[PDB]
Amino acid sequence: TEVTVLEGKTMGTFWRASIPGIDAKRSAELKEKIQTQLDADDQLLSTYKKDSALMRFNDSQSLSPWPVSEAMADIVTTSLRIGAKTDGAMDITVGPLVNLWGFQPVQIPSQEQIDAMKAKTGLQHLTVINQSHQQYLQKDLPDLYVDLSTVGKGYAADHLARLMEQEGISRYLVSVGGALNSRGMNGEGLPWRVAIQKPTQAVVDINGHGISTSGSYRNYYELDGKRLSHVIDPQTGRPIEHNLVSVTVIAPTALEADAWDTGLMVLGPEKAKEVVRREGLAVYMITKEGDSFKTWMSPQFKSFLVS
Amino acid sequence: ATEVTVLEGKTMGTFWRASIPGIDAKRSAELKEKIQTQLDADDQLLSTYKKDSALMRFNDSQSLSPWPVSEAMADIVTTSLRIGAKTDGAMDITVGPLVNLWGFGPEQVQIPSQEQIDAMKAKTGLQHLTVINQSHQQYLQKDLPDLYVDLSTVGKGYAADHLARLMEQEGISRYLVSVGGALNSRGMNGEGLPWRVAIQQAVVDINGHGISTSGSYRNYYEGKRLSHVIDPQTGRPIEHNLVSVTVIAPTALEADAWDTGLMVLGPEKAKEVVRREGLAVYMITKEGDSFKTWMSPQFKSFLV
Ligand SMILES: [Ca+2]
Ligand SMILES: [Ca+2]
Ligand code: NA
Ligand code: NA
After folding, report:
1. How many CB atoms lie within 10 A of CB A25?
2. Dihedral (C-alpha) B285, B152, A80, A263: value to the nearest 10 degrees?
3. What terms describe the molecular function in GO for this protein (chain B)?
4. Fewer CB within 10 Å, N or C, chain A?
5. If we measure between CA atoms, which residue out of B11, B14, B82, B70 comes closest to residue B45?
6. B183 bridge partner residues
């Protein structure tokens, strides 16, 4: 059967929904629902909009529980846990440190300034409180600053998938930026096509899962022998220096994948592989070694490959 | 055409099954061991019939302060409380004392007076339980010492989802796993077709999804007696004619949570929730000697 592709803009990037063919009125109605939901998610999570739910929390100096939506609570919960499991490499409180660099560095902070700033960051400073009819965030530092840009697209893709289910669409491939979520087979009873970066192509079936990628071998800045990156390691408060070009993660949700791919990118190849082993993650890595790109997959990732 | 290996065993007072194509005897044996070990651990985490389960340690405590639990415990309870809210209290993981008052637990009295029921209701309610999450730790907290939490209505869905995680960990991409009536389906069977999932036979294809069924069987094969399903709000047996609910959801845990709540609510109130939440649901009602069925549009999308 045929396929309808809807596309639009959100979160500084694009969204796409590929679904079984629907009629024109149905397609228009669905696109309106999708854009409305994504607009609301952007308004929930954005740091750019000073009136977002997130930015209202940031602007509050309260150390008491702060009411939030179920989505906010769950995004932060997942972020804190994957933060913990990547030894702090995935850190949604690192904003103040990032703000020191203007992210080649053009304005560089001293070691003293870095140290002063990391005192206003830390995953330990956040708590999520869930109850039946309400939920909260709580910070123990008034000027803690939370930034969800590294996990927002993954959530948005998951939420987009749930919207499809609610609309009686149980076969789909949806995406927000590089974060994808898919369930069910395509019109020909085969996996929805999800292609992986081939640096020199591998295809995966992410049915029942989400996938997300951090980095690209086509946006890998490198001067002399040094990596040039605007990605700040939250434990050093400095840009990463390793040769991990891109990391792709398949996880049970795109939110999780989006959190993992960020943490693993920060950790770099050796430490990322230890986390991948420990957690049994499905991961694909591209590294730059001399004049060649090298690829690597965990056993769990290989199981998702299609032929 | 490739051979499907079927592994089965006991867990949580019921049985589990895993169907996996193209797997050899050595791998099957290793996989059965891992499955049983994991399910044993999930039973040890959740069971109210195991005196030293993680859950029973919490239940036995009189503490009103945060109580450390596993990530899985935190998420199961969070999911349960929210779906409890969205079913207007019908799905209630704190209803145990009322069920025990009637003696309607599976492993066990006089008919209680309404006065006694109402007094017992003071020891129950979704509002009494909180889940707290932090980077390296998470907690349950009750504001009533004798609150009693029972997760039997969602434990099978969780366990089935957790089995899917194990399949992935083990590099198994095609499978049908089930714990009692909770299942997850992924990929093609040995014949290269979607796993056959039958509802009592109408057939659904739930590839990439989970499913669960809940029912009321005291009169299913007759009515001559009461339902043993207690309405958490009245503290009395349900009086409506809904005898089975099947839910298809992205996860078996969600499915298992909804099917219990919808079952308690009954046909009219369940349909309201199903519409508002856009759920994929199949309902069986028994009027007198005649069964009637109803499917939401979202459920119909899964029919073959
Ligand atoms: Ca990310
Ligand atoms: Ca249930
Ligand atoms: Na700090
Ligand atoms: Na009560």
Report:
1. 8
2. -80
3. metal ion binding; transferase activity
4. C
5. B70
6. B178, B211
- At how many degrees (to 10) do helices B155-169 and B25-46 cross? 140
Count of Cβ atoms closer than 10 Å to residue B125 Cβ = 19
Q: Which candidate, B56, B57, B87, B76, places its Cα nearest to that of B131?
A: B76
CA dist B11 and B18 (Å) reads: 13
Please enumerate in sequence order all residues whose Cβ is within 8 A of that of B186, keeping only pairs 6 or more positions apart, or say none: A207, A208, B164, B167, B173, B174, B175, B176, B195, B207, B208
Q: How was this model experimentally determined?
A: X-ray
Contact: B172, A303; criterion CB under 8 Å: yes
Interface touch B133/A282, C-beta < 8 Å: no
Give the distance (Å) from ligand 3 centre to CA of residue A118. Answer: 5
Cβ–Cβ contact B165 with A under 8 A: yes
DSSP B285-301: EE-SS-EEEEE-HHHHT
Please tell me what DSSP assigns to residue A125: G
CA-nearest of A250, A238, A247 to A265 is A247
CB-based burial label for B98 (10 Å; 0-12, 13-18, 19+): buried
Q: How many CB pairs under 8 A join A and B?
A: 108
DSSP category for residue A156: H
Q: Which residue has the tokens 């029942």?
A: A208
Please, which residues have CB within 8 angstroms of residue A37's CB and are 6 or more apart in sequence? A159, A160, A163
User: Which of B131, B208, B298 shows the shortest C-beta gap to A183?
Assistant: B208
Cβ of A127 within 8 Å of Cβ of B129? The answer is no
Quick check: helix, strand or coil at residue A25? Answer: helix
> What separation in Å is there between the alpha carbon of B131 and the centre of ligand 1?
26
CB atoms within 10 A of CB B265: 25
Q: Tell me the C-alpha distance between A204 and B208, whole Å.
A: 14
- Could you tell me the domains of chain A? 1-307 (3.10.520.10)
| Tokens found for residue A14 | 């694009």
Contacts of A240 (CB under 8 A, 6+ apart): A227, A229, A231, A232, A233, A265, A266, A268
User: In the 8-state DSSP scheme, what is residue B128?
Assistant: G
Q: Return the amino acid letter for B100.
A: N
Say whether B298 and A182 touch across the interface (CB within 8 A). Answer: no
Contact status of B172 with chain A (Cβ, < 8 Å): yes
CA pair distance A63, A61, nearest whole angstrom:
7
For residue B210, which of B257, B171, B269 has the smallest C-alpha distance? B257
Interface residue A92 vs chain B (CB under 8 A): no
Q: Do the chains contact at B250 and A162, CB–CB below 8 Å? A: yes
- Paired with A102 in beta bridges are none
Ligand nearest to the CA of A96: 3
Q: How far apart, in whole angstroms, are the C-alpha atoms of residue B154 and residue A61? A: 39
Q: Which helix (H) or strand (E) holds B169?
A: helix B155-169
Q: Chain A residue closest to B131 (CA)?
A: A130
Angstrom CA distances, A48 to B7, B211, B288, stand at 53, 40, 61
Residue type, B122: A
Per CB-CB distance under 8 Å, the chain A contacts of B247 are none
Instruction: In whole angstroms, give the CA distance from residue B233 to residue B244.
Output: 20
The answer to whether the beta carbons of residues A266 and A231 sit under 8 Å apart is: yes
Structural contact between residues B197 and B205, judged by C-beta atoms closer than 8 angstroms: yes
